[PDB]
Amino acid sequence: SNCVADYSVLYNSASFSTFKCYGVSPTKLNDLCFTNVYADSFVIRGDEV
Amino acid sequence: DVVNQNAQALNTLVKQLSSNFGAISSVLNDILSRLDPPEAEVQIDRLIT
Amino acid sequence: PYRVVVLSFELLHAPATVCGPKKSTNLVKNKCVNFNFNGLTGTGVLTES
Numbered sequence: 001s002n003c004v005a006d007y008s009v010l011y012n013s014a015s016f017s018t019f020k021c022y023g024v025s026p027t028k029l030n031d032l033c034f035t036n037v038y039a040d041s042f043v044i045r046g047d048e049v
Numbered sequence: 050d051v052v053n054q055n056a057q058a059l060n061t062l063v064k065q066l067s068s069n070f071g072a073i074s075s076v077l078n079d080i081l082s083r084l085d086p087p088e089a090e091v092q093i094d095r096l097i098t
Numbered sequence: 099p100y101r102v103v104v105l106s107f108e109l110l111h112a113p114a115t116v117c118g119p120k121k122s123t124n125l126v127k128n129k130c131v132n133f134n135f136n137g138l139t140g141t142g143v144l145t146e147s
Contacts, residue, residue, distance in 0.1 A: 001115040001116050002115050002116075003115075003116065004117065004118055004119055005116050005117070005118045006118045006119050007118065017100055021105070023083070023107070023109065024083040024084065025083055025084050025085045025088060027085065028082065028083060028084075028085075030118055030120075031082065032082060032083055032109075032137060033114060033116065033117030033118055033120060033137055034107045034108075034109060034114065034116040034117070035107075035108055035109060035110065035111060035112040035113070035114050035115060035116060036107060036108045036112060036115060036116060037105070037106075037107045037116050038106045038107060038108070039103050039104070039105055039106070040102075040103065040104035040106060041101075041102075041103045041104075042101075042102050042103075043099050043100065043101050043102065044099065044100065044102055045099060045100070046099065046100045049100065049102070078138060078139040078140070079110075079138065079139075081139060082137070082138075082139050
C-alpha cells in the first residue's frame, strides 16, 4: 500500500500459469484502483493450483 | 391511511434499489467499472430481474 | 514448483492507498460532467458542498 501499482508491467510477462481474477475484470485491472492489496506470495507444486 | 399506504409503497420501491438480488453489488456503475460486457451479463441480468 | 502470488485485495472500505498511474484531472464545478471520484463512475452537476 501507499504506492503506485501499475498492472501493465504485470501483464507483459507472458509466462503466467493461470492469469485469472475472481473479483473484477482482468482487463480492468489498471482501470479500477484499490484501497489495500494483500499478496499471498508463495511457491508450491504446480498441480495444487 | 391512504397517504401512508402510498408512502410505504414508494419507500419500499426505493429501498429495493440497494438490494443485491444475488449479484456482486447493487450499484450498476461499479458493475460496469469492474466486469466485461460478456462477463457482466449474468449479474446485470440478476439486477434487471 | 510455481511461484504463486494470490493477488487479494479489499475494495471500498477505506480511502484509496493503492492507485496506479491514472492521471488526475482538473476539478470543475457546477457542470453536468461525467466525473470519476475515488474510482466510482458518477455523473452529474458538482456543486460545492
